[PDB]
Symmetry: C3
Subunit: 50 residues, 3 copies
Amino acid sequence: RMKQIEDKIEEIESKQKKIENEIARIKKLLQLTVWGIKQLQARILAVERY
Amino acid sequence: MKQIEDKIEEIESKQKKIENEIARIKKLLQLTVWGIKQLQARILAVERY
Amino acid sequence: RMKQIEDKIEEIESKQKKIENEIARIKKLLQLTVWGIKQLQARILAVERY
C-alpha cells in the first residue's frame, strides 16, 4: 500500500513541474504579445496623424 | 490513511482543472498571435502605400 | 515515510493554489490583449476604408 501511494505522489509531482514550465512559457509569450500590440498601436497612430 | 486518499483524489482533480485551463489559455494565445501578425501585415500595407 | 507523504501533499496543494492565482492573473491580461487587438483592428480598418 505504501509503495503505490508513493507512486501516485511522484506522478502528481511530475505533472505539477510540467504545469509550472508551461506557465513560464505562457508568461513569456504573453509578454511578447503585449509588447507587439504596443508596437502596432504606435504605427497605426502614426498612420492616422501623418 | 483515508484522509490521504481523499487529499490525493482532490489534488488530482485540481491538477486536471489546471491542465484544462492551461489548454484554453494556449488555444487563445495562439489565435491572438495569429491575429497580431495579420494586423502587422495590414498596417505595413498601408505604410507602404 | 508517511510524514514525507503528508508534507509532499501539502506542498502540492500550496503550489496548486499559487498556480491558480497566476492563471487568474494570466486570464485578466489575456482578456486585456484581446480587447486591445479588437480596437486595433477597427482602427486599421478605418484607415483601410479610405
